[PDB]
Design a binder for these strands. Structure first.
Ligand code: FES
Ligand SMILES: [K+]
Ligand SMILES: [Mg+2]
Ligand SMILES: [Mg+2]
Ligand SMILES: [Mg+2]
Ligand SMILES: [Mg+2]
Ligand SMILES: [Mg+2]
Ligand SMILES: [Mg+2]
Ligand SMILES: [Mg+2]
Ligand SMILES: [Mg+2]
Lengths: 295, 110, 86, 168
RNA sequence: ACCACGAUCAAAAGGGACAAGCAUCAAGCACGCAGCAAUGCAGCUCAAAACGCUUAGCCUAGCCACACCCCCACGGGAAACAGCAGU
């Protein structure tokens, strides 16, 4: 009938890509690593514009948003219950099919329990066995302690939210419970302190916006965009909000009033926005500075 | 098509015709000098069966491997004379030439 | 500096050197602008531009002179005659 | 310095920059070129710059050169089936010659990508053995598993010196 | 299991490739080819190192060689740890 868009829809990806922005200086920040002597080229004005164009293309690949997945369902499937083996072993066996050309989500990984049961391995056992035999660079078999609540607050105090998301992406799977828990705790810390600029020009901004829109908490990000003269982004944020909440007070108000442009932010600020008063004030200040520049 | 001979097709220069129905052919290959990383010619001798005794010392020939060696050192046969000595036919135009000069102009037959 | 006494030679040398000063261009105030390869008489010197943190990996006399110039990162190799003045 | 003109040719980096990898049918490649003449200039640069790169990527293909045997330069390839491929190169540059032979007798980028993948199957990450062949030598290197006794002494209960002592 | 007109593994045989030093080792001396055969031709290798002397286990997931000596082992000399421990 009428399906609500997904994160990977072409319309949603285009909106979130523009809201993210593309800053070559931040996307290609100098990395602290083993260095080599740089090379030099003599370029005309046209060759330089072409080299800058290729850098923008390489940046749009680096800003590719990871897909937002729902939490995976636990695995609980018994293949056999060989009761004759009960009490013959004290430790369980973990059998991993290491056939090279098989997707990791299609590999059979089973466990023979001391009770004689042959069951499929759980998601946590799977990702651990896959790292044992197919070690991925940046991933650890034992969960690093950085992901403890006490150590994440230290990372947030230093405004290293992107590092937390880079660590989480390398350690956990996108549909894992640990992955979703860490991403949501990082998004919530950014919303509480208004640190939305830390994720701009990164591949994690779209996932953060997707989280605020679904949980109906875009007031903070909307205020941040107006204070930075990003009304084109602030207007798309309200439109994306109406698209994902069609049967809402704001979405209807925009239809009844045929609101467009800045008018959408006013309709949203009065109906569904929780900080409606602070949005009208922040929006009023913007229109003033825009009039002074016009005059 | 199978054959127990290693070198299936090779081009070489005839350097001897003193054996009956056998042409002695010098074959050169480029071999990389590992230290200098420069290619140098490495030559090897092959005996080729020439049933019609049509090979002349100095002509360039194409050798085809035999299914099995017909003698201790005869593992190939004359498949084609590429460049007859002193009687070259330009493959690009099909006209006879003497070095870098035509003996019959390509314009003769249009 | 030349003199019968060593301290007199020290005085002459350092007082004269300050009147024969070069100016050395430095890339980002820590290395040279490009690889330098030259021969002076029979002494060969090959210098390489290096990134930050590389340090001075050079003949000990070149290290001393680099610290006076203000070069922090460079590689140098000396071949042929190792004549200090050359 | 390195001897000769264009010493870059005598470096492994330059030799590996060849993009011509002949199909399995190519067995011999003869090169007929002239030492003098403006119309044979591209063929001379081809012999000077590219033949080393071709031979490096095709070590088992015989390459033989011939000087001043005909009025114009040309390449000729001899295939395993007995077919011969004549390529007229007069007036062409050495780059146009390399692009031509790559199109008619070179393996495409797809065929080469596949071959590289079939090689990666020979070094399975899950296998244990010497560093020359495997990433890890022993399972004790995997975090969480019982470490090597040479680094962390095993508990007395897991050692035969004290298992037999108690049992005996 | 048995046949596998197959796969795997791998001899013998054929082709190719494959250590170091000495050229004051420069020639080797039958080392080739044709023919169904009879037999005919006189060729074959070599300074791009033949032929020869000397040294050495090797290219190490391991491989090669040897197994008291006479390269071999009918035979002979002779009576065997280069399996472990030991002298
Ligand atoms: S090397 Fe793994 S137990 Fe010793
Ligand atoms: K023996
Ligand atoms: Mg064999
Ligand atoms: Mg000599
Ligand atoms: Mg002597
Ligand atoms: Mg020898
Ligand atoms: Mg020995
Ligand atoms: Mg003994
Ligand atoms: Mg014996
Ligand atoms: Mg013993």
């Amino acid at each position: 009938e009428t399906k609500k868009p997904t994160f990977m829809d072409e319309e949603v990806q285009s909106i979130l890509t523009k809201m993210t922005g593309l800053n070559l200086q931040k996307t290609f920040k100098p990395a602290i690593q083993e260095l080599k002597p740089p090379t030099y080229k003599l370029m005309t004005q046209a060759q330089l514009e072409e080299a800058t164009r290729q850098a923008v293309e390489a940046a749009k690949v680096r800003l590719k948003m990871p897909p937002v997945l729902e939490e995976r369902v636990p695995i609980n499937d018994v293949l056999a219950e060989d009761k004759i083996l009960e009490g013959t072993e004290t430790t369980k066996y973990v059998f991993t099919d290491i056939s090279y050309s098989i997707p990791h989500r299609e590999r059979f990984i089973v466990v023979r329990e001391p009770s004689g049961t042959l069951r499929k391995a759980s998601w946590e056992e799977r990702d651990r066995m896959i790292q044992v035999y197919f070690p991925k660079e940046g991933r650890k078999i034992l969960t690093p302690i950085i992901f403890k609540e006490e150590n994440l607050r230290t990372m947030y105090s230093q405004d290293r939210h992107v590092d937390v998301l880079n660590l989480c992406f390398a350690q956990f799977e996108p549909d894992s419970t640990e992955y979703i828990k860490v991403h949501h705790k990082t998004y919530e810390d950014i919303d509480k302190r208004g640190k939305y600029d830390l994720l701009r020009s990164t591949r994690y901004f779209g996932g953060m916006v997707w989280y605020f829109v679904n949980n109906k908490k875009i007031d903070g990000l909307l205020i941040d965009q107006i204070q930075r003269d990003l009304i084109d982004d602030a207007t798309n944020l309200v439109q994306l909000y109406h698209v994902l909440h069609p049967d809402g007070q704001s979405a209807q108000g925009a239809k009844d009033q045929a609101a467009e442009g800045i008018n959408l932010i006013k309709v949203f600020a009065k109906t569904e926005a929780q900080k409606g008063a602070y949005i009208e004030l922040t929006l009023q200040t913007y229109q003033e500075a825009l009039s002074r520049h016009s005059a | 098509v199978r054959s127990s001979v290693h070198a299936r097709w090779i081009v070489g220069k005839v350097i001897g015709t003193k054996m009956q129905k056998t042409a002695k052919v010098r074959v050169t290959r480029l071999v990389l000098d590992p230290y200098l990383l420069k290619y140098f010619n490495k030559r090897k001798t092959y005996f080729a069966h020439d049933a019609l005794q049509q090979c002349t010392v100095g002509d360039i020939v194409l050798l085809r491997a035999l299914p099995v060696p017909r003698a201790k050192h005869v593992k190939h046969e004359l498949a084609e004379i590429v460049f007859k000595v002193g009687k070259v036919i330009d493959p690009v135009t099909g006209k006879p030439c003497a070095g870098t000069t035509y003996l019959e102009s390509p314009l003769s037959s249009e | 500096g030349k003199a019968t006494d060593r301290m007199d030679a020290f005085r002459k040398a350092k007082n004269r050197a300050v009147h024969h000063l070069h100016y050395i261009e430095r890339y980002e105030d820590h290395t040279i602008f490009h690889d330098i390869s030259l021969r002076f008489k029979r002494t060969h010197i090959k210098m390489k531009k290096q990134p930050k943190g590389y340090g001075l990996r050079c003949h000990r006399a070149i290290i001393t002179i680099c610290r006076l110039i203000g070069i922090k990162d460079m590689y140098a190799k000396v071949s042929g005659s190792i004549n200090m003045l050359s | 310095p390195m001897k000769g003109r264009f010493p870059i040719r005598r470096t492994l980096q330059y030799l590996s920059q060849g993009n011509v990898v002949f199909k399995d049918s190519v067995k011999v490649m003869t090169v007929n070129y002239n030492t003098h003449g403006e119309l044979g200039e591209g063929a001379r640069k081809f012999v000077f710059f590219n033949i080393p790169q071709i031979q490096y990527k095709n070590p088992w293909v015989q390459i033989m050169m011939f000087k001043n045997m005909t009025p114009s330069p040309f390449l000729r390839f001899y295939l395993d089936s007995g077919e011969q491929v004549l390529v007229d190169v007069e007036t062409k540059s050495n780059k146009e010659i390399m692009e031509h032979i790559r199109k008619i007798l070179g393996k495409n980028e797809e065929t080469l990508r596949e071959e590289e993948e079939e090689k990666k199957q020979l070094s399975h990450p899950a296998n244990f053995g010497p560093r020359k062949y495997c990433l890890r030598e022993c399972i004790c290197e995997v975090e969480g598993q019982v470490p090597c006794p040479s680094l962390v002494p095993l508990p007395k209960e897991m050692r035969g010196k004290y298992k037999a002592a108690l049992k005996a």
